Design a binder for this molecule. Structure first.
Ligand code: NA
Length: 121
């Protein structure tokens, strides 16, 4: 049907906006601390601590599979990256600190993306 295509055209444009959002968020992690999943070979106990791991490459594969229905789902994944890090790592570490900064710097970008999504559809 013609409805399904118009929907697919919107999902596609939502994917195009979320791609740009993802690039802007990832630019706020120049150290690439959140680039890739936490290594289970290197932190073998990680899953005893963190039940839902997340990272920017894993978000990217979901993004390109058009697996984000809306901005809320996308934000959930971003928040996981931050919240996981802040639990596993103590306050006085470079990792915890990198998350706090990513959160603060990401808020501006997510603020405007919420307006652009409401505004465009
Ligand atoms: Na902790």
């Amino acid at each position: 049907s013609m409805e399904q295509v118009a929907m697919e055209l919107r999902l596609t444009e939502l994917t195009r906006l979320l791609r740009s959002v993802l690039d802007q968020l990832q630019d706020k992690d120049p150290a690439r601390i959140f680039a890739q999943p936490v290594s289970l070979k290197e932190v073998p106990d990680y899953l005893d601590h963190i039940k839902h791991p997340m990272d920017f490459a894993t978000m990217r594969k979901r993004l390109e599979a058009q697996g984000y229905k809306n901005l809320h789902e996308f934000e959930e994944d971003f928040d996981l990256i931050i919240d996981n890090c802040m639990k596993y790592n103590a306050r006085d570490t470079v990792f915890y600190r990198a998350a706090v900064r990513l959160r603060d710097q990401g808020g501006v970008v997510l603020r405007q993306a919420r307006r652009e999504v409401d505004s465009i559809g």
